[PDB]
Design a protein around this ligand. Structure first.
Ligand code: 6W4
Ligand code: CA
Length: 223
């Protein structure tokens, strides 16, 4: 997250860290046994880390649970990033409490202008590289589909939305992908892609979660 703020320990209780020996992606806990992340975060040997603040220090509220199964969306296209969503089933149910909690799925899609919270452990610089140890947060509005398409001609599908600031300076960045975009207590987006970070006219692009609620619910109900 570039131009954000320190969230505060365990204030984003649905945020998880995907670890394969090191943090590589965010995710969102949607029930005691399932996490939503980006399909581009797929890899073997994922350990889901819940209740994290400083990802380099064991602080006392963590739960580390291996993934038993990963399900990438059947229509994910890694060249276009269309349908950039995946489900991860935990080997065991997380113990839910105030600091490790699920996030509700949207019923309804969120409009341009809706304010959201984006969080992650990604790079905090737009030029240069600095990876924080603690969770960073950014409040950002959903942008109109027309401004999103004008920023990225020929690349925004009906399964994507932009959020952020066209003036730049505040955005998600490398290491934040797979993480949550929450609006009014609902998971509306997944950090997906963008052209660099925090650059003018290049806002972040997010997977539109509301389009996947039927697939998420059916997949969990069966797996
Ligand atoms: N400003 C918007 C914006 C927001 C988020 C991103 C972003 O995070 N992004 C952009 C993401 N992404 C993936 C792709 C297509 C190839 C499929 N295009 N864009 C990838 C992630 C990143 O770079 N994360 C660093 C992370 C990694 C995880 C999965 C795949 C690739 C890289 C990594 C790798 C190795 C070690 C540690 C971490 C990029 C831009
Ligand atoms: Ca920790």
């Amino acid at each position: 997250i570039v131009g954000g703020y320190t969230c505060g320990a365990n204030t984003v209780p649905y945020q998880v860290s995907l670890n394969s020996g090191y943090h590589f992606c965010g995710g969102s806990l949607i029930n005691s046994q399932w996490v939503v992340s980006a399909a581009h975060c797929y890899k073997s040997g994922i350990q889901v880390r819940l209740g994290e603040d400083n990802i380099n220090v064991v602080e006392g509220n963590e739960q580390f649970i291996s993934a038993s199964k990963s399900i990438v969306h059947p229509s994910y296209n890694s060249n276009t990033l269309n349908n950039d969503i995946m489900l991860i089933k935990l080997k065991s149910a997380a113990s839910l409490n105030s600091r490790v909690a699920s996030i509700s799925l949207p019923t309804s899609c969120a409009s341009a202008g809706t304010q959201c919270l984006i969080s992650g452990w990604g790079n905090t610089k737009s030029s240069g590289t600095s990876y924080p140890d603690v969770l960073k947060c950014l409040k950002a509005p959903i942008l109109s589909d027309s401004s999103c398409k004008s920023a990225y001609p020929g690349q925004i599908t009906s399964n994507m939305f932009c959020a952020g600031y066209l003036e730049g300076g505040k955005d998600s960045c490398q290491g934040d992908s797979g993480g949550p975009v929450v609006c009014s207590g609902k998971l509306q987006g997944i950090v997906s892609w963008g052209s660099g970070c925090a650059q003018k006219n290049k806002p972040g692009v997010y997977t539109k979660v509301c389009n996947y609620v039927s697939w998420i619910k059916q997949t969990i109900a069966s797996n």
